[PDB]
Enzyme design. Structure first.
Site, PDB file in Angstrom:
ATOM      1  N   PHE A  41      -6.107   0.832  -8.801  1.00  0.00           N
ATOM      2  CA  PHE A  41      -5.626   2.207  -8.649  1.00  0.00           C
ATOM      3  C   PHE A  41      -5.450   2.930 -10.021  1.00  0.00           C
ATOM      4  O   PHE A  41      -5.912   4.066 -10.182  1.00  0.00           O
ATOM      5  CB  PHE A  41      -4.284   2.171  -7.853  1.00  0.00           C
ATOM      6  N   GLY A  42      -4.785   2.247 -10.969  1.00  0.00           N
ATOM      7  CA  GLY A  42      -4.428   2.723 -12.306  1.00  0.00           C
ATOM      8  C   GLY A  42      -3.422   1.826 -13.010  1.00  0.00           C
ATOM      9  O   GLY A  42      -3.501   0.601 -12.888  1.00  0.00           O
ATOM     10  N   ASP A  43      -2.446   2.419 -13.736  1.00  0.00           N
ATOM     11  CA  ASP A  43      -1.452   1.657 -14.533  1.00  0.00           C
ATOM     12  C   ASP A  43      -0.006   1.663 -14.014  1.00  0.00           C
ATOM     13  O   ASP A  43       0.359   2.460 -13.155  1.00  0.00           O
ATOM     14  CB  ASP A  43      -1.455   2.125 -16.010  1.00  0.00           C
ATOM     15  N   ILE A  44       0.806   0.750 -14.570  1.00  0.00           N
ATOM     16  CA  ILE A  44       2.232   0.581 -14.289  1.00  0.00           C
ATOM     17  C   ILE A  44       2.980   0.833 -15.593  1.00  0.00           C
ATOM     18  O   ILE A  44       2.635   0.256 -16.620  1.00  0.00           O
ATOM     19  CB  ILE A  44       2.570  -0.783 -13.645  1.00  0.00           C
ATOM     20  N   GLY A  59       1.722  -2.577 -17.434  1.00  0.00           N
ATOM     21  CA  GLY A  59       0.742  -3.197 -16.544  1.00  0.00           C
ATOM     22  C   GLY A  59      -0.433  -2.318 -16.147  1.00  0.00           C
ATOM     23  O   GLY A  59      -0.594  -1.210 -16.673  1.00  0.00           O
ATOM     24  N   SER A  60      -1.273  -2.831 -15.211  1.00  0.00           N
ATOM     25  CA  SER A  60      -2.489  -2.180 -14.680  1.00  0.00           C
ATOM     26  C   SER A  60      -2.781  -2.569 -13.204  1.00  0.00           C
ATOM     27  O   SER A  60      -1.952  -3.221 -12.557  1.00  0.00           O
ATOM     28  CB  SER A  60      -3.697  -2.486 -15.571  1.00  0.00           C
ATOM     29  N   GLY A  61      -3.946  -2.143 -12.700  1.00  0.00           N
ATOM     30  CA  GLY A  61      -4.428  -2.391 -11.340  1.00  0.00           C
ATOM     31  C   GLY A  61      -5.725  -1.669 -11.017  1.00  0.00           C
ATOM     32  O   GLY A  61      -6.305  -1.008 -11.890  1.00  0.00           O
ATOM     33  N   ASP A  71      -3.522 -11.209  -0.866  1.00  0.00           N
ATOM     34  CA  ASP A  71      -3.706 -11.316  -2.292  1.00  0.00           C
ATOM     35  C   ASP A  71      -2.566 -12.159  -2.874  1.00  0.00           C
ATOM     36  O   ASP A  71      -1.837 -11.734  -3.783  1.00  0.00           O
ATOM     37  CB  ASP A  71      -3.844  -9.913  -2.933  1.00  0.00           C
ATOM     38  N   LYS A 113       4.155   3.302 -10.909  1.00  0.00           N
ATOM     39  CA  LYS A 113       2.732   3.033 -10.682  1.00  0.00           C
ATOM     40  C   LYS A 113       2.097   4.424 -10.622  1.00  0.00           C
ATOM     41  O   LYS A 113       2.555   5.299  -9.875  1.00  0.00           O
ATOM     42  CB  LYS A 113       2.465   2.257  -9.367  1.00  0.00           C
TER      43      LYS A 113
END
Ligand SMILES: Nc1cccc2c1CN([C@H]1CCC(=O)NC1=O)C2=O
Ligand SMILES: [Zn+2]
Lengths: 381, 294, 789
Positions: free
Chosen positions: B19-22, B15-17, B127, B37
């Site tokens: 902030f950065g990645d998962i 994953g992503s976001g 969210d 994370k």
């Protein structure tokens, strides 16, 4: 009940057959020796116990290559305080199998070692390389004669050889301990310090765990028998150190029987009050007994006790067959419901025809032997 | 190669976001699989330390994942937590962008409860979207988890229970598709806005799309002016047409709440529970995706 | 660091061996008796026995056999000690001077070897060609008998039969031939082997291996004209000469195992047989060939260890468990039956299982009252200083524990008797005994085949008359372990307290036991109180007005309430089974069977126990005693003594909880009891007095010395060893060395008082040799040391 108890002992998850050694190294009793210590080994090794290892670090690999050229013997420290690396006792480990692999451009060495001799730590010195040496004193194995040897009548010497097991043991005790009437104690007291009787009492509990016969599988020498039983008792490190400190097979066998009778419950070490299993659920899925040491893909060694049922455990994730120590079974990480500490793994069969269909492998380091009702802990002899 | 917290080796990105990645990580001591994370220290949009703090407050709730470790490794901030299953958006895609009234109603029950818990702990999520609701793994495969607390805000003081002031002139927080009408107007978000967003999420599973979904504009500022005005031009009765009355009752209730007013979660759960019973459905945990895997 | 002096007060009285022959002269018939470290030489006269010579050896006599080789005018004596010292001895007299000269000697121990289950077997060939020894399993040691074997060199023959029961050299063989009973998975068999001295191996025996009885234990080699061998089992007596096989199954021998024999007639016509219960049988052989075998019950003797036919119907009965006897047989005089008449009785205090010191008469001079013998031989013995004056009280059952109660003017004795199971459901006694013949009796209140049952009892014995005033019987399966006589709490009464265990064959560890408080007052025994505990009460001690009892691995302190009940004050859970319990002040000595020694202190301000020190050196421990606050005396495996010491002054806490081994000594005796007291009338060079009783009826004394006295007597020992002639040429230092099969260490912290005292018996020229730094000045020192016993 059809798995193949010869499988876990082979350590087949380690890959291709290792190079084997036939030679044997034993140091003289009471002698002082300087032996290297493997830095990341945290286990308390019992003589005759198999220790598998996966070494990754260049310093560890180098040390083993040197041992394989010399005596093949390293020191396995019984840590009283693991954090500050404190040890008063320990056991020598002799490499009997090895394999060097160049996995991902890095030299990796897999090793199978066996516990040989008990020792008293005299000094520990870490060298300028970061690898430490132990100045050690080899602890002798105390062999005592029959308790009746110094108290037997010479006319009854020809009666000392003897030809419904309960009726047999009754006659064994009456004839072997007849000359107890020349002393301060009865026959029944001498029986409590008799190797053969103590080993027969242990065999009765080992049969409760495995259906394999005494005839072959179990040793006849009290020393070997006592060490074989010590290796597969699920006790904490403080108790195991005390057990390692015992020099007499009589005292070791007595001490084992007492643990086997007293400690009926097995709790989470972190909780101390959370019950995980009981001795009634203990069973042998390996020839070694219910518990043996296995190494994981990153070189972490777990003394894994196989039990039928466990409670107060949550399963993390889905089952996996990757690096399974019990071929044909998939593992799922099991944590304590209260403190979420890793207790072991649940093993579930991959084939419907397999028996048992499920069991638990609990890591000894996570467990705490408990006396039912309300009392502290004590190991007589 | 990349080990965090001394025992979690990174396997692959999952994953992503902002902030950065998962990442999928494995506990090198026992085989345990976890989610990691990863956020750069000196990241444009930091949230990991805030999330780590907010997971300490939320721990104990059902459907709130367990945190293993928060710390630093190299030039990153690291949050090690429970590995969870796919999101509702992943499962919606798997089910060919179509959910049965039975799935939507079984989901609705857990989604109200998940938001409710966050609200009892004095926070609003801000969210609410299908992507932040994930099913668990193994034992937790029928348990839904509300995650991503980076936009979560305190709406009231823990002891005094004093609600946050009423403000206007606020830029929108979260995704525009499921944002409340008042959040679009720049009005300050509170409990009612999380609930209203949940109504949009349910309508989105009900109708393949939403009336303001296929509204393109060059810039994000223009993209929202259309969504906002389409939401305001679309009566709840028009959006919920052809669907059970309960969906309109739900959205009308939420839009009828005062700023500082507590939603009656029992009432909202009951609307859907009474409908589920009426449709002759059982809470057997046979979702649409459960069936495609059968 | 200790400085102790050990001396014999009473020499061993138990007989382990006896042989007849022509040792003193070719014309004299001798009786040689072994009493462990003592060898007695007698001339057999028509009247009785004439004492000729008595020697002591620096060893425990294991084998004692007479033999007359070629060229010899008279018999020689082969002796093997328990420390494997082998020797050939000769009697030599010139005028009045008698000397046991050593013809050959040597140590026959092997650096490798499992000492055999059936013990040491020493056999001599009928033609005196060799000595055969079975010391270790899987080996047969051969000592060739030649004039050129003064060092007694030996070789071993491998023996495939690992479990040899008994072995003898056969008669009428051209080559030395051994006949033996062995056991293998199939069972018991009899086998023969020829012995080659040239080849140093065994050859095929004269006759084939025959399958014998499951309980075949004894081999008897028959001399010419019969030949062959007699094999004795539990049910049968079989004969084997090869092709010739004759079996008998007398019902007369089924009652008890035959464990000794002796040849009567030189041609092997008649044999005497003794069983474990004192029955004496005559085995007769009817005659070139053997016509038939017959057994005749002659009568009853003391339980015999060894039998020896002297002449004119007289037989010497060597006993370990009871008194030795000279018995007259009236085998002939066919109008009257076969009957055994005792001519003489010889005092045997062994085994001494317990004892106590009582100042019965003089109110200054102490007397020793022992629990002696076992089974029908069981008695009490009253020992006083006159030689030692001994009074005997037969009980006809096993005395086990003893304590004196001054207030009631009686002794309390725990005893046991064997009863056989009934057809009617119950048990029957074998003979009347002290516990079935008391003037008053009582039984404990119960709760809820032909097999032997042990019944336990508390006997009340009058201190003047030694009559059994009362006998209290314990419960079925209840084993009485510990006995105390004391006053508790604020109670003016003196009680007899018994600690027991419930013993069932199915249970390995006792889970039940009792502490029974009795009162013997106004000529009646009553049960005052009874506490049921969850284990065996091994030991009990009166501890400062309280009762300290050891229940399994627990040490429990009880208070005596005003409601006359025992109330638990504190418990102390030990790492060991609390077998031995000793107390000095607020200090407690806890020990186990495996030499685990623990020191505890009662903390009155906390009301609990605190461990002071420990020492765990695994070995069998038979007894322990507190010498003083800092020293502990124990008896441990392979007949040794040891002393442990504490150092309450030490700067480190590791040192002050460590007991230092400061004394080691090979006593040659097995101690059952240590007892503070003296038999002598109460500026002395000795401090303290601990008496001890042994399995062989030996009574010793341990006392402490000063460093000056120790150093003087130690040098004196090394000097005495250079001048004294040791029978068998055994070194004193080797003999006194601490011994186990795994280790042999020189003796430390102990003076051999017996060796020091023997200075008085050495000649004036030899005395002058010892004192060459004045001999009369040393006589004064030694005479002062004789006054302690
Ligand atoms: N696959 C993997 C990755 C990282 C650590 C570990 C594993 C597998 N595993 C254990 C699990 C139980 C077993 O039977 N064998 C193992 O080796 C670990 O401890
Ligand atoms: Zn726990």
């Amino acid at each position: 009940i059809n798995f193949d108890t010869s499988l876990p002992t082979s350590h087949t998850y380690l890959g291709a057959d290792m190079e084997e050694f036939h030679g044997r190294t034993l140091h003289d009793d009471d002698s002082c020796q300087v032996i290297p210590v493997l830095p990341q080994v945290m286990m308390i090794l019992i003589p005759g116990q198999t220790l598998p290892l996966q070494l990754f670090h260049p310093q560890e690999v180098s040390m083993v290559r040197n041992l394989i050229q010399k005596d093949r013997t390293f020191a396995v420290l019984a840590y009283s305080n693991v954090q500050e690396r404190e040890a008063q006792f320990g056991t020598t480990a002799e490499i009997y199998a090895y394999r060097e692999e160049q996995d991902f451009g890095i030299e990796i060495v897999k090793v199978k070692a066996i516990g040989r001799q008990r020792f008293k730590v005299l000094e520990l010195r870490t060298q300028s390389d970061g690898i430490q040496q132990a100045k050690v004193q080899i602890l002798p194995e105390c062999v005592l004669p029959s308790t009746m040897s110094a108290v037997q009548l010479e006319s009854l010497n020809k009666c000392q050889i003897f030809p419904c097991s309960y009726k047999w043991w009754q006659k064994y005790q009456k004839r072997k301990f007849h000359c107890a009437n020349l002393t301060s104690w009865p026959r029944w007291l001498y029986s409590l310090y008799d190797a053969e009787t103590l080993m027969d009492r242990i065999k009765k509990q080992l049969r409760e765990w495995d259906e394999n016969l005494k005839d072959d599988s179990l040793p006849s020498n009290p020393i070997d028998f006592s060490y074989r039983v010590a290796a597969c008792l699920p006790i904490d490190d403080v108790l195991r150190i005390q057990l390692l400190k015992i020099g007499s097979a009589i005292q070791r066998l007595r001490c084992e029987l007492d643990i086997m009778n007293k400690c009926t419950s097995l709790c989470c070490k972190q909780c101390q009050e959370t019950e995980i299993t009981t001795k009634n659920e203990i069973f042998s899925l390996s020839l070694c007994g219910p518990m043996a040491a296995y190494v994981n893909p990153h070189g972490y060694v777990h003394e894994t006790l196989t039990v039928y049922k466990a409670c107060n455990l949550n399963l993390i994730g889905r089952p996996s067959t990757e690096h399974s120590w019990f071929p044909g079974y998939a593992w799922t990480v099991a944590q304590c419901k209260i403190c979420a500490s890793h207790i072991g793994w649940k093993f579930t069969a991959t084939k419907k025809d397999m028996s048992p269909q499920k069991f638990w492998g609990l890591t000894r380091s996570a467990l705490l032997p408990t006396i039912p009702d309300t009392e502290d802990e004590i190991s007589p002899d | 190669e990349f080990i965090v917290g001394g025992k979690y080796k990174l396997v692959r990105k999952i994953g992503s976001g902002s902030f950065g990645d998962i990442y999928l990580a494995i506990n090198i001591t026992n085989g345990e699989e976890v989610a990691v994370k990863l956020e750069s220290q000196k990241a444009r949009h930091p949230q990991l330390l805030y999330e780590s703090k907010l997971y300490k407050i939320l721990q104990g709730g059902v459907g709130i994942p367990h945190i293993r470790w928060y710390g630093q490794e190299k030039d990153y901030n690291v949050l090690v937590m429970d590995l969870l299953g796919p999101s509702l958006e992943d499962l919606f895609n798997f089910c060919s962008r179509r959910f049965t009234m039975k799935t939507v109603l079984m989901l609705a029950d857990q989604m109200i409860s998940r938001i409710e818990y966050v609200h009892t702990k004095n926070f609003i999520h801000r969210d609410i979207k299908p992507d932040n609701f994930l099913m668990g793994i193994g034992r937790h495969c029928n348990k839904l988890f509300l995650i991503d607390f980076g936009l979560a805000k305190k709406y009231r003081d823990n002891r005094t229970r004093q609600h946050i002031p009423y403000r206007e002139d606020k830029n929108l927080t979260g995704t525009a598709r499921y944002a409340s009408i008042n959040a679009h107007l720049g009005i300050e978000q509170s409990r009612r806005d999380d609930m209203e967003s949940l109504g949009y999420v349910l309508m989105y599973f009900n109708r393949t799309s939403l009336p303001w979904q296929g509204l393109k504009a060059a810039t994000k500022k223009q993209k929202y002016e259309k969504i906002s005005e389409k939401k305001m031009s679309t009566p709840v009765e028009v959006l919920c047409k052809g669907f059970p009355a309960e969906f309109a009752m739900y959205l009308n209730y939420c839009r009828g709440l005062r700023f500082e007013e507590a939603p009656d979660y029992m009432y909202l759960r009951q609307l859907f529970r009474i409908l589920f019973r009426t449709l002759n459905h059982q809470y057997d945990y046979t979702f649409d995706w459960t069936m495609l895997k059968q | 660091m200790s400085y102790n002096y050990v001396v014999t007060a009473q020499k061993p009285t138990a007989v382990n061996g006896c042989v007849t022959g022509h040792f003193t002269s070719a014309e004299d018939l001798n009786l040689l008796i072994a009493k462990n470290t003592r060898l007695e030489i007698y001339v057999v006269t028509a009247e009785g026995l004439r004492p000729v010579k008595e020697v002591g050896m620096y060893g425990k006599i294991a084998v004692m056999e007479l033999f007359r080789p070629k060229g010899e005018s008279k018999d020689l004596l082969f002796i093997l000690t328990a420390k494997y010292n082998a020797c050939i001895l000769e009697y030599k007299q010139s005028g009045e001077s008698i000397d046991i000269i050593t013809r050959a000697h040597g140590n026959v121990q092997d650096r490798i070897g499992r000492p055999s289950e059936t013990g040491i077997i020493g056999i001599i060939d009928p033609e005196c060609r060799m000595i055969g020894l079975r010391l270790y399993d899987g080996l047969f040691k051969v000592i060739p008998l030649d004039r050129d074997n003064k060092e007694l060199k030996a070789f071993n023959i491998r023996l495939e039969e690992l479990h040899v029961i008994d072995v003898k050299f056969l008669y009428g063989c051209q080559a030395p031939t051994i006949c033996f009973v062995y056991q293998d998975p199939q069972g018991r068999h009899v086998k023969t082997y020829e012995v080659s001295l040239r080849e140093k191996e065994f050859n095929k025996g004269p006759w084939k291996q025959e399958n014998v009885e499951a309980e075949a234990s004894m081999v008897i080699a028959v001399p010419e004209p019969f030949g062959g061998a007699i094999i004795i089992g539990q049910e049968s007596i079989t004969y084997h000469n090869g092709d010739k096989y004759l079996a008998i199954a007398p019902p007369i021998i089924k009652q008890s195992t035959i464990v000794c024999h002796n040849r009567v007639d030189p041609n092997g016509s008649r044999y005497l047989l003794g069983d474990m219960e004192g029955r004496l049988f005559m085995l007769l052989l009817e005659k070139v060939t053997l016509k038939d075998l017959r057994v005749e019950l002659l009568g009853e003797t003391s339980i015999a260890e060894c039998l020896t036919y002297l002449d004119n119907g007289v037989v010497f009965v060597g006993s370990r468990l009871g008194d030795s006897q000279l018995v007259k047989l009236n085998v002939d005089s066919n109008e009257q039956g076969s009957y055994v008449v005792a001519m003489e009785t010889f005092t045997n205090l062994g085994p001494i299982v317990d004892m106590c010191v009582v100042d019965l008469e003089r109110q200054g001079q102490g007397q020793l009252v022992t629990c002696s013998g076992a089974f029908k031989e069981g008695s009490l013995r009253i020992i006083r200083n006159g030689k030692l004056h001994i009074r005997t009280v037969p009980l006809y059952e096993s005395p086990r524990k003893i304590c004196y109660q001054e207030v009631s003017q009686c002794f309390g004795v725990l005893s046991s008797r064997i009863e056989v199971q009934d057809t009617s459901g119950g048990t029957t006694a074998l003979r009347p005994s002290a516990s079935t013949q008391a003037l008053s009796s009582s039984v404990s209140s119960s709760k809820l085949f032909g097999e032997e049952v042990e019944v336990h009892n508390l006997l009340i014995i009058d201190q003047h008359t030694f009559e059994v005033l009362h006998a209290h019987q314990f419960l079925q399966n209840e084993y009485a372990l510990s006995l105390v006589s004391c006053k508790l709490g604020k109670d003016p009464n003196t009680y007899f307290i018994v600690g027991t265990a419930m013993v069932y064959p199915e249970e390995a560890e006792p889970k039940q036991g009792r502490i029974v408080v009795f009162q013997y007052s106004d000529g009646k025994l009553q049960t005052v109180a009874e506490k049921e505990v969850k284990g065996a009460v091994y030991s009990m001690v009166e501890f400062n007005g309280k009762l300290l009892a050891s229940i399994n691995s627990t040490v429990r302190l009880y208070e005596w309430t005003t409601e006359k009940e025992l109330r638990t004050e504190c418990n102390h859970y030990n790492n060991i089974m609390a077998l031995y319990l000793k107390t000095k002040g607020d200090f407690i000595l806890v020990g186990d069977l495996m030499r685990s020694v623990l020191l505890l202190a009662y903390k009155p301000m906390e009301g609990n126990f605190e461990e002071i020190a420990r020492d765990f050196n695994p070995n069998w421990m038979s007894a322990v005693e507190i010498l003083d606050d800092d020293n502990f005396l124990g008896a441990e495996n392979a007949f040794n003594l040891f002393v442990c010491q504490k150092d309450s002054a030490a700067t480190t806490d590791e040192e002050r909880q460590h007991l230092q081994e400061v004394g080691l000594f090979h006593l040659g005796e097995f101690v059952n009891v240590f007892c503070h007291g003296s038999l002598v009338m109460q500026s002395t060079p000795t401090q303290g007095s601990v008496l001890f009783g042994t399995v062989n009826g030996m009574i010793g004394l341990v006392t402490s010395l000063s460093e000056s006295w120790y150093n003087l007597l130690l040098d004196m020992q090394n000097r005495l060893n250079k001048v004294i002639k040791s029978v068998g040429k055994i070194e004193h230092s080797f003999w006194r060395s601490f011994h186990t099969e795994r280790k042999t260490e020189p003796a430390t912290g102990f003076i051999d008082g017996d060796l020091i005292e023997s200075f008085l018996d050495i000649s004036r020229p030899k005395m002058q040799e010892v004192v060459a730094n004045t001999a009369d000045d040393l006589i004064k020192v030694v005479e002062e040391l004789t006054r302690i016993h």
